[PDB]
Symmetry: C2
Subunit: 137 residues, 2 copies
């Protein structure tokens, strides 16, 4: 059976600015780099940046809702969002759901999110106020 996410791999158009974004701006740990990629960690997450000449710098209106959310504590959320804002990182959505969320773009337009709250927290809120058509299992 499957036991979790093993790794997330993001195709990148330019390796250096992507390493700078994930390591220096977002604070992830850089473990290795090679001519066409890098390995970083963020808590348990194994992130791979893969240099790919097929990656387009993609405006958010031109990509679907697929996105990658990173955990942060409530206490740290506002200062991290302010850090991204200072760095000029673009926002692609405003938060309208439960739990703090900041929706931001990576240099290639990958859709990212900072989120505070677990699946258990979300399910508890949904049980009290179910979405349209919502069924629990």
């Amino acid at each position: 059976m499957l036991s979790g996410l093993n790794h997330l791999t993001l195709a990148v158009s330019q390796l250096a600015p992507s390493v700078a974004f994930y390591q220096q701006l977002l604070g992830m740990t850089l473990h290795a780099r090679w001519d066409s990629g890098a390995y970083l960690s963020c808590g348990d997450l194994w992130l791979c940046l893969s240099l790919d000449p097929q990656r387009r710098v993609t405006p958010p209106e031109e990509s679907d809702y697929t996105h990658y959310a990173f955990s942060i504590s409530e206490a740290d959320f506002a200062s991290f969002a302010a850090r991204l804002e200072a760095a000029g990182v673009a926002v692609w959505k405003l938060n309208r759901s439960e739990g703090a969320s900041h929706y931001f773009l990576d240099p290639d337009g990958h859709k990212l999110e900072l989120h505070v709250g677990s699946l258990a927290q979300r399910l508890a809120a949904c049980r009290e106020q179910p979405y349209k058509g919502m069924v629990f299992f």
Copy 2:
């Protein structure tokens, strides 16, 4: 700071076949389903399937290398891969450039992977068989 992937959200074009793929075929746990999405877990991974009219069924030659790998044990890897093959699940890559992996597509062409091994194990393997120009930190 950031610690871990909070959740992975995949945009899907048809909710029912996608839920069936992740729950029935891949064995993930379905927690809730509503008219426009579903919440599943795979170990400690929170997966959200989000119905998105913008999602296109995308052939693998039309998308970049961005992909999502799920952990599986050495004992279960081959029989799970063979069952996906026998079920007609499409593939997108054959060459094992990052260890023991099986590369397959979801119904919308999201690039998925079964992988055996941790980041620490991949780094150890790379010390002996490094990618071109590899540096370790």
